[PDB]
Design a protein around this ligand. Structure first.
Ligand SMILES: NC(=O)C1=CN([C@@H]2O[C@H](COP(=O)(O)OP(=O)(O)OC[C@H]3O[C@@H](n4cnc5c(N)ncnc54)[C@H](O)[C@@H]3O)[C@@H](O)[C@H]2O)C=CC1
Ligand SMILES: NC(=O)C1=CN([C@@H]2O[C@H](COP(=O)(O)OP(=O)(O)OC[C@H]3O[C@@H](n4cnc5c(N)ncnc54)[C@H](O)[C@@H]3O)[C@@H](O)[C@H]2O)C=CC1
Ligand SMILES: NC(=O)C1=CN([C@@H]2O[C@H](COP(=O)(O)OP(=O)(O)OC[C@H]3O[C@@H](n4cnc5c(N)ncnc54)[C@H](O)[C@@H]3O)[C@@H](O)[C@H]2O)C=CC1
Ligand SMILES: NC(=O)C1=CN([C@@H]2O[C@H](COP(=O)(O)OP(=O)(O)OC[C@H]3O[C@@H](n4cnc5c(N)ncnc54)[C@H](O)[C@@H]3O)[C@@H](O)[C@H]2O)C=CC1
Lengths: 268, 268, 268, 268
């Protein structure tokens, strides 16, 4: 009806109702989009969470590390949206880093296997999602991934920040490939969102000093955001993703939109 | 009706029908916005150009270097939109650099007075427009200025690039001030647009080697843009500005949106 | 004898013994360089300060806003270093912004004349120094200016940050011109140094809230500097400038070296 | 005797005499440094290459993917430099990406195992080298890794660019850890160097179009370098690394020094 009217959009990464992807999906639906959802390891839970969406959406299984899931993904989406229909939009809202790559675990002590797994899911999967789905995307389409500005190092995020640096770089290459399809690829760099995991880390699940650091990070973020930053509100990020999913940023690709309150533009 | 429905938006910088601001204004109107226009030194011409807009819009005089124009500006806009109404949107699409600051004139030979004038109109005026208009802007409002990525030096643009670097920096401070009003401030970094002036420089008005360089710049831009770059089409930039004028990028301020085909994200 | 042995280097910007340029000059002398100094409005004071340098150095008057000073500068330097001798090194350590462009004076209230003056001295003069001196610089030479990272807005520095953004951009163009002479042009982005002016602003000369903000800026800087930041020690910055003046960064030009403790690479 | 007099420096990554690390090692020796070298899979060859160095240097085996090599590394270096002696300097000049991650092999077709291996050797190993060696580094020490600016995507370099983005990010975290030891960590972003591998790719070993693209990349680099770029001369990069290994950039860490001719600062 409005922003995304008629668009067909795959949204990955809903796991709980505080998933950023939950709000992206909600807002996209409110904006006229038709969704296909993907979920990874807790499918029954995703479905039960997604029941709360403004509209029903087919849910497909996708373990971004499973090569068969990816191989079959486009066929499954075509099944879900019907033959001869294509996606206009793909949202990657997927990220993971083993606990060793994060928080109080010393940066040097994260074993490569762990880091590799995190980079697989958090960075490489952006490309492999774009590989699976570009064949079934319309000209004018839009792939959006979720980013957390890794331009500068920060406490606790450790190897996830490295993963995000890799993602940003993947995104620029995906844009090169997507452009052949008339498709844009972009990242939304969000401010900290109080996701279940984030609340758990502030509460110390990855060590006390990590939790204290991330709490300071959050406070500093809202302080230097010229328009403030509400970490309990994923809506301004969901809207931003929708902005990129829409026809309203048609000359932007390979790029990063910062939905962070303007915090990254301010030193103090 | 759509993107900018109900919004009231001042658009500066229409001088010809190939002004970027012409397309911004056209698109904003198509998207439901109500406009107040400003024009500088050729008011009769601006009016005659703007007659072609989808809707009529009050045109106000604003010479960004005239302190009285700025002092009176908000009152004049309030007159134009009616008492008790405010602006939701301000577009700065203003830039100028004396010929000595550009093209074949050696970078070192631009006299400071010339450079100063260019920086006044091209950079400082962004702040002084925000000063004049923030008192008459609604919470949730949006100031947008036009940028040309000055991260790296380039032939011919010389002191205008310096002016743009200054603008980017002004924009981050304006965001600090705007945030007090619940207002975002952002720049759109556009790709090269074949504006009358740009066509004139490609044709050699600022020297042959400058024209040859800018023609190469343009070709290179479209080449590395993963989705291409059409310098004859200001529409993708107008849409981008509208995107920023809208409620769809609500967490972005002090920032730069690149409507350049993705060209800045690619080396070759 | 060591780093700068045999090099002839103009150093501007010594005004007190806590001038960054004082330490640059001291270190360059310790490293074998032969200096010509320039001073602006307090020549007797500069001379008396410079008497403390490890070696005597001719002092020349240069008001970067005085076109005759600039016109005569190279002849005066040639007089000072002797006919047929050239400079290997130029240090721009010059900056000024009227009080209205800074601190507690609202960013919007700085009159353009004031801002223009600040940008003249702080940014444009880098080019006009390079114009005066490149004709008398040797292949392999090095121009270095002093920068304060203006990538993000910050309290109190207001229009000086804008000035620094303009400088960074000027530096990239100066590099284009300098390269014709076989000369590098680069900026050193220093951390906050407790210069007389800086101490005065921390003490509130530009308003209490500005002083409080700059004190917080300083503390935050040392906190996120992975190797710390000592604002009372200009030596690590002087060394960095010498590094750039030397043959040891021969492939770096148009660029910015950050002598800030690594602070800019860290978010928190 | 000069720049690195008395310093003890581990240099990894010599494999042929056109290895960047060969020139780093040569220059460091010329500058007074005492070296320990490491070599990976062709030890007899490294030794035979290193015989040509100005001075003899113990060569140690280090397969950055071998956890036992890393576990033993510091003991082996202490053996080589003698008990109670420490390193002042560590050079990481290590990089690898399987052919599938590069050139004409479509970016989407690089299998994760391949990419992971490349990121292991090219990015993660920078951290794991810093882990092995920081316990045996002196305050004031310097770790330097080799970077190729991955800020923008480019043809052919594909997943190696992603690897370099990951490296840059690793470097910022390593700086955090190194600072505890009084140690700096920095990257040198070099211009293209005609290394054996690079010559082989220009000659088409990774596909014709890749070779054509990299040849264009190289030409463009020298064109926009304000001081030119000689891809056949690794010396300006070796000097830059030495600059970072020295006491002359003491306030720089977590950072990237661009030894690229200034090319990255120029658009065209
Ligand atoms: N929460 C925050 O503060 C910020 C998060 N982000 C990013 O937003 C994106 C979404 O995460 P959030 O909503 O915060 O957390 P979340 O935990 O709600 O979402 C992460 C999603 O990744 C999915 N996932 C993990 N491994 C997978 C695999 N092998 N295959 C398929 N899917 C897999 C999870 O199932 C989950 O649905 C992530 O990329 C995250 O890094 C970006 C900025 C800030
Ligand atoms: N044409 C291009 O390739 C690109 C242009 N831009 C920027 O877009 C903005 C709009 O310019 P264009 O549409 O290209 O050219 P234009 O010439 O159509 O618009 C420039 C406008 O600035 C106005 N102006 C000049 N001095 C003024 C003053 N003292 N007071 C008030 N207004 C004044 C002019 O009247 C004109 O309307 C400028 O900021 C320009 O630098 C940004 C990227 C690319
Ligand atoms: N103090 C700090 O924390 C930092 C300073 N910087 C920069 O370092 C450079 C040196 O300044 P500082 O040593 O801090 O202060 P300073 O006050 O000791 O040096 C500023 C110099 O600029 C000179 N100057 C001013 N107007 C002039 C004109 N019209 N012509 C010629 N010279 C003129 C002054 O005489 C003075 O010698 C400046 O560019 C400053 O912005 C950069 C980063 C940090
Ligand atoms: N050649 C170029 O144009 C540029 C190269 N660089 C970087 O310079 C660094 C040095 O490479 P180059 O001198 O060009 O090539 P090179 O092939 O001479 O050096 C690469 C080195 O990495 C070592 N290596 C590979 N796998 C290893 C492992 N598992 N364990 C230990 N060492 C291993 C190789 O043995 C070789 O010595 C690399 O990081 C490269 O990416 C950076 C910019 C430009």
């Amino acid at each position: 009806t409005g922003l995304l009217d008629g668009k067909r959009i795959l949204v990955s990464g809903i796991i709980t109702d505080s998933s950023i992807a939950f709000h992206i999906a909600r807002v996209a639906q409110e904006q006229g989009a038709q969704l296909v959802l993907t979920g990874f390891d807790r499918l029954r839970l995703t479905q039960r969470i997604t029941d709360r969406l403004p509209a029903k959406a087919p849910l497909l299984e996708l373990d971004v590390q499973n090569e068969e899931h990816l191989a079959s993904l486009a066929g499954r989406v075509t099944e879900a949206i019907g033959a001869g229909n294509k996606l206009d939009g793909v949202v990657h809202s997927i990220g993971f880093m083993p606990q060793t790559g994060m928080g109080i675990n010393p940066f040097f002590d994260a074993p490569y296997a762990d880091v590799s797994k995190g980079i697989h899911i958090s960075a490489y999967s952006y490309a492999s999602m774009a590989k699976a789905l570009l064949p079934i995307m319309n000209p004018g389409g839009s792939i959006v991934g979720m980013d957390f500005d890794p331009s500068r190092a920060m406490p606790a995020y450790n190897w996830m920040t490295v993963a995000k640096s890799a993602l940003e770089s993947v995104n620029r290459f995906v844009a090169r490939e997507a452009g052949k399809y008339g498709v844009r690829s972009n990242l939304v760099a969000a401010g900290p969102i109080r996701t279940l995991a984030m609340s758990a880390i502030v509460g110390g699940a990855l060590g006390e000093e990590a939790g204290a650091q991330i709490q300071l990070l959050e406070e500093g973020w809202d302080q230097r955001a010229p328009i403030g930053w509400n970490m309990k509100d994923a809506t301004p990020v969901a809207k931003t993703v929708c902005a990129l999913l829409s026809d309203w940023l048609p000359a932007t690709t390979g790029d990063i939109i910062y939905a962070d309150g303007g915090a990254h533009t301010q030193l103090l």
